[PDB]
């Protein structure tokens, strides 16, 4: 498809720094530390944070808005699978799902007219 690389970047760009100020206790900020939690990674297939996010999007891997919206739903996702409901991590995941749909539901938008 034939739509303007750039300006759909510097979209996603901003777009997921929105997403970023949504998570204000920074818990998603960074990969799953492996330090901390060395079982994290028994039942995660595909471990997803903001910082992997930013690295995939400098590196073209998004080159659909369908992609960079699938990854975000991986840090929602990935932290309801492991955490207890009880935890700091699962209710911070639980919040950043109903706020990071907002924040997606307007950069999709935008996106679609692109194209
Ligand atoms: C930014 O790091 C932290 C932030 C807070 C807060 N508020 C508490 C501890 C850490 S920690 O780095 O000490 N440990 C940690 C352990 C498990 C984790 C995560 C972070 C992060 C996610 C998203 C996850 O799902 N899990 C299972």
């Known amino acids: 498809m034939e739509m303007q690389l750039t300006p759909f970047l ?18 998603f900020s960074e990969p799953v ?18 910082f992997t996010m930013k690295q995939n999007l ?7 808005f369908d992609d960079f919206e699938e990854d975000f739903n991986l840090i929602v996702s990935n932290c309801l699978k492991y955490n207890a409901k009880d935890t700091i991590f699962y209710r911070a995941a639980v919040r950043l799902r109903e706020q990071g749909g907002a924040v997606l539901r307007q950069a999709r938008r935008q996106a679609e007219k692109m194209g």
């Open 58 to 64: 400098e590196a073209y891997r998004y080159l659909n």
């Open 33 to 50: 530390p492996l330090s901390e939690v060395p079982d994290y990674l028994d039942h995660i297939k595909k471990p997803m944070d903001f």
């Open 10 to 27: 510097i979209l996603l760009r901003k777009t997921l720094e929105q997403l970023q100020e949504k998570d204000t206790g920074n818990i």
